[PDB]
Design a protein around this ligand. Structure first.
Ligand code: OGA
Ligand code: MG
Ligand code: NI
Ligand code: ZN
Length: 331
C-alpha cells in the first residue's frame, strides 16, 4: 500500500505531465497521495495562471464576512457577520491596516503559534465564496474554470444525465481568516490555487480516520452535535493542532504559498488560516473513485448547511433514501 503513514505529498509535474489533469490526479493517487486527504502540486516553471494581478482591485466583494469566534483558544466556533460591500482594493487596504495586518513574526511556525494563541480575540473579515475566476482564458493547463464538470463525470460513470453547473469561487483573505473543519459537499474533491499574496496554512485528517475527528467534534461541541448528526457540514467548528494531538487524532499540516495548488481528496477533513492579504480560487471536482464516497456522504438536514443548486441532483441520484429529508432541510 502506497503512503501508509498518510503523509501529505508534494508533486512537481513537468509541463508535459501538466497537460492532462485527470491523468495526473490518477497518478498522484497511484502514489498514495489521497491517503493524506491533501496534496500540494507545484506547477512547472513554464506555467502561469495569468499575466499579472495588476488589474483586480475592482472586483466586488458583495458580502464580506466578519468571522466572530466563541469558545476557548483551541476549541471554538465562528459565526459569519455580514458586512457592507467593498472592492478588492478596499479590502486589501483594510487587510493591511494596523487593526488587521499580520504581526511581526520570525517564521511560519511562530505565526502559527500566534494564530492559535490569539485568533479568538479578533474578528477578521473574509471575502469568501465569490463566483468567478482569475485564470486567463488562454491558460490551458490546470485552469480551474475549464475542468470537466461533476455532472459530466456522474453521467460518464453512471449514465444519468442531470441538471446543474460547476463553477469556481474566489476567496480574498487576511490575517487570521479561518476555514473551519469540513469535508467538501458530497465528499467531493477540491482544488485550490493561491493566486497571490500571503500564505495559507492547512490542517488535514486522513480520510481513513475521518470518523475519529467526527467523534472528537461531537465530544467538544455537544450542543451542536445534539442539534444535527452532521454538524461539521455547518462549517463553523475549529479545533487546534494541540487539542488534536491531546486526543490522539491523526492529522498533518502544510503551508501553501502563492503559485501553488492544493488538492483535497474525498472525505479529507481540512481546516486552516490565512497569513495575510491573499487571493485563492477553488472548485470542486470528481473522479471515478469519488462515486463511492458520494454515495456514503453524510448529510445535514437541520437546515443550517444550505448549499448550491447543483447538490440537489447529487443527493437525488446517489442518495435517494436520504433525499426527502435532506430537501426539507434545504426548504
Ligand atoms: O481557502 C479557503 O478558505 C477554504 N478552501 C477550501 O476549503 C478548499 O479549497 O477546499
Ligand atoms: Mg478589477
Ligand atoms: Ni474545502
Ligand atoms: Zn445541520
Amino acid at each position: 500500500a502506497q503512503n501508509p503513514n498518510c503523509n501529505i505529498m508534494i508533486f512537481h509535474p513537468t509541463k508535459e505531465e501538466f497537460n492532462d489533469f485527470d491523468k495526473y490526479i490518477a497518478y498522484m493517487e497511484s502514489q498514495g497521495a489521497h491517503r493524506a486527504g491533501l496534496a500540494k502540486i507545484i506547477p512547472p516553471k513554464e506555467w502561469k495562471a495569468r499575466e499579472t494581478y495588476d488589474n483586480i482591485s475592482e472586483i466586488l466583494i458583495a458580502t464580506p464576512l466578519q468571522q466572530v469566534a466563541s469558545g476557548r483558544a483551541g476549541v471554538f466556533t465562528q459565526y459569519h457577520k455580514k458586512k457592507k460591500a467593498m472592492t478588492v482594493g478596499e479590502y486589501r487596504h483594510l487587510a493591511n491596516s494596523k487593526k488587521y495586518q499580520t504581526p511581526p513574526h520570525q517564521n511560519f511556525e511562530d505565526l502559527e503559534r500566534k494564530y492559535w494563541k490569539n485568533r479568538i480575540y479578533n474578528s477578521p473579515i473574509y471575502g469568501a465564496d465569490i463566483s468567478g475566476s482569475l485564470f486567463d482564458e488562454n491558460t490551458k493547463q490546470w485552469n480551474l474554470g475549464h475542468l470537466g464538470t461533476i455532472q459530466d463525470l456522474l453521467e460518464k460513470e453512471c449514465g444519468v444525465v442531470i441538471e446543474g453547473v460547476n463553477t469556481p469561487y474566489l476567496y480574498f483573505g487576511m490575517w487570521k481568516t479561518t476555514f473551519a473543519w469540513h469535508t467538501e459537499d458530497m465528499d467531493l474533491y477540491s482544488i485550490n490555487y493561491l493566486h497571490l499574496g500571503e500564505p495559507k496554512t492547512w490542517y488535514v485528517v486522513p480520510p481513513e480516520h475521518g470518523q475519529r475527528l467526527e467523534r472528537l467534534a461531537r465530544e467538544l461541541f455537544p450542543g451542536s452535535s445534539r442539534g444535527c448528526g452532521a454538524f461539521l457540514r455547518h462549517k463553523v467548528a475549529l479545533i487546534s493542532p494541540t487539542v488534536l494531538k491531546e486526543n490522539g487524532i491523526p492529522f498533518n499540516r502544510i503551508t501553501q504559498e502563492a503559485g501553488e495548488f492544493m488538492v483535497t481528496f474525498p472525505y479529507g477533513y481540512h481546516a486552516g488560516f490565512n497569513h495575510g492579504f491573499n487571493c485563492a480560487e477553488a472548485i470542486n471536482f470528481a473522479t471515478p473513485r469519488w462515486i463511492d464516497y458520494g454515495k456514503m456522504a453524510s448529510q445535514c438536514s437541520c437546515g443550517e448547511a444550505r448549499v448550491t443548486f447543483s447538490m440537489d441532483a447529487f443527493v437525488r441520484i446517489l442518495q435517494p433514501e436520504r433525499y426527502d429529508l435532506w430537501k426539507r432541510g434545504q426548504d
